[PDB]
Ligand SMILES: [Ca+2]
Ligand SMILES: [Ca+2]
Ligand SMILES: [Ca+2]
């Protein structure tokens with residue numbers, strides 16, 4: 039009844055009960071069941087009466103997800119490319135939060151969710167004609183690499199732990215990881231962005247056995263331990279537009295450490 | 309814009325008339341709280357709180373101390389921190405994190421050799437400069453082809469500079485302490501500081517850079533910990549400050565660190581002679597140091613306690629640990645320890661050690677070696693550091709737990725009935741106990757007995773399990789009672805303040821240890837007839853007096869240093885320059901930072 043900075047959440051509630059009544063009724067009858075946008079514009083106008091387009095634009099930005107927010111993909115990029123771990127990222131998160139007051143970084147589960155979108159096994163795709171001897175599922179993630187290899191005391195002994203992606207799902211993920219660049223190159227070559235022609239991809243796959251990936255996690259020089267990575271890269275995407283082929287996309291630096299996507303990891307002598 | 313103006317002018321006139329009449333025309337805060345609550349309704353507390361901030365107006369970014377705290381308590385490199393910085397700056401558009409040079413400037417303040425201080429009287433043989441930070445630990449040790457070849461890289465702070473930086477690091481905390489104790493902020497009483505000393509020779513601090521597991525290299529880190537600060541208000545000493553977690557990873561301030569075996573006694577003494585000179589100089593002086601305006605007079609008490617038995621015996625001039633003179637507190641023989649279990653006193657100081665070494669080297673009464681060594685109770689070396697008579701706690705409970713593990717392996721085999729077996733039934737007994745315990749408690753056995761193993765093994769349940777492996781009828785109770793008493797005893801020393809954590813155990817400890825001694829002496833004489841291990845002498849006979857002399861036993865222990873070893877390795881590979889000269893002062897600087905407190909109360913801001 040007196041002021042509002044000191045009036046608590048429910049004290050203000052009882053102060054403007056009737057404000058809330060009128061605004062909610064008018065909103066959900068005029069905008070067809072909505073109150074967010076109307077109270078948003080209401081506060082924008084009632085603060086812009088004091089010509090504060092700085093704060094107006096800042097608030098429209100936070101409503102547009104751009105500014106002091108770090109959308110989860112961005113924080114995931116930082117945590118990956120900075121080699122942070124989850125406990126350390128949580129330390130930094132809570133510290134920046136408690137000091138600033140804002141929430142500049144995003145919590146861990148908002149990174150797991152934004153990660154699920156970037157691995158393989160998320161998008162719906164379909165082959166034609168369907169792939170012989172290949173499954174039809176579309177949520178196939180990290181398969182065991184042995185591929186159901188017979189592992190008992192009766193068959194040829196094998197202890198090489200190995201993980202991999204399914205080739206088709208990983209290739210689909212690698213393509214929808216660069217959808218944006220595909221579309222940008224499509225525009226740049228003066229092509230109708232609404233096109234679905236037979237895009238000819240050109241991939242370059244390569245395995246290379248590395249040596250001595252073992253360490254010293256303890257008091258002992260454990261053993262020589264070798265690994266083998268099979269990997270690939272989307273070298274060049276072309277389309278058969280008109281009567282010719284045009285590079286919708288060409289890899290800038292083909293043989294770079296961060297354009298060679300991993301596909302299979304095994305611990306075995308090459 | 310014009311569109312929404314038209315669309316909403318009705319609500320406009322409605323809300324404006326109603327809010328102008330209701331609260332007096334303060335539509336600003338009214339509509340503010342309106343949209344706040346409306347947006348919170350749909351669980352948008354993120355956007356609601358950031359809008360509360362944007363209207364309040366505050367702290368869009370951080371200040372350099374916080375960024376420094378983050379990259380130190382997160383172990384970021386400089387390339388990585390810069391990468392994160394520029395990413396956030398380009399995405400947000402603001403500048404939340406601070407550039408690297410800002411963090412170097414905010415770092416120059418928290419390292420030692422920044423503040424002014426004044427010793428009065430001056431420190432004998434110590435310089436008077438105040439800006440001496442990281443200096444070569446060899447202290448100008450002559451290194452030519454003609455000298456005793458030394459090759460140990462070693463960095464150190466000057467001891468007084470280190471203490472000055474620690475004190476003006478915990479300035480805010482001890483000011484808050486005086487506030488809480490109903491004293492004056494502007495009081496300059498002679499603050500007596502009580503510092504703990506701890507040196508521990510961590511080993512195998514190397515890593516394979518290329519091919520070849522050849523060389524193992526060791527290290528030594530000498531460090532201290534401000535343990536309490538106490539002003540003498542009027543005619544009483546009030547505890548302005550006490551360390552919450554005394555033997556903790558991150559209050560053991562590093563002071564000196566070197567790459568050299570802990571038992572390379574010449575090198576060790578070459579490195580630690582200057583430090584001992586400095587800590588002997590600053591025992592008859594008073595640090596004058598302006599702290600929050602007004603200047604204060606500090607006055608120190610050093611206590612060397614973070615020493616495992618090995619270094620205690622090495623740097624006090626005592627025979628190696630497997631001698632006949634077992635206790636480093638009382639001069640008694642192992643045989644006489646087993647005859648008389650708990651009646652000993654504490655009678656081995658440092659001045660006594662020096663004087664006995666003088667007796668040895670001089671040999672005043674002209675007697676052969678085997679009665680001279682009785683005269684000098686096993687002191688045949690010149691004492692080097694002044695440590696105090698005390699028992700470690702970590703190694704104490706580990707040793708006692710290993711001895712119970714041995715007793716278990718013996719009871720399984722019923723060594724009492726048929727003694728003197730061979731060295732195959734021994735391993736059989738061991739594997740039996742191992743398989744049995746791994747089956748019953750998922751307690752997978754290991755060789756280097758750590759603290760988790762000792763923690764799990766020393767439980768009434770473990771004896772209740774292993775009791776199902778002895779054909780006897782009474783060894784059951786003869787282990788049950790034994791474990792009962794050992795557990796009634798463990799908190800007394802393991803506690804960081806047994807006076808106000810378990811005073812019943814403390815007032816019964818004498819009776820419990822005496823009964824424990826009787827029980828070992830009667831139902832276990834087949835083992836403790838001669839040899840009794842050192843820790844079953846310390847634990848049994850000296851705890852109820854180490855308590856009355858120092859308070860606790862758990863606080864004055866080496867755990868704080870034993871943990872820091874982790875950090876070292878990490879730093880040495882993640883934050884260093886491989887230069888073999890800079891590569892060690894970097895580790896030492898970063899460890900000093902990590903151990904700071906003006907940053908731990910930033911990385912603990914989420915709680916408060
Ligand atoms: Ca190769
Ligand atoms: Ca040691
Ligand atoms: Ca150690």
Ligand SMILES: [Zn+2]
Nearest residue numbers: 635638652845
């Ligand atoms: Zn003793």
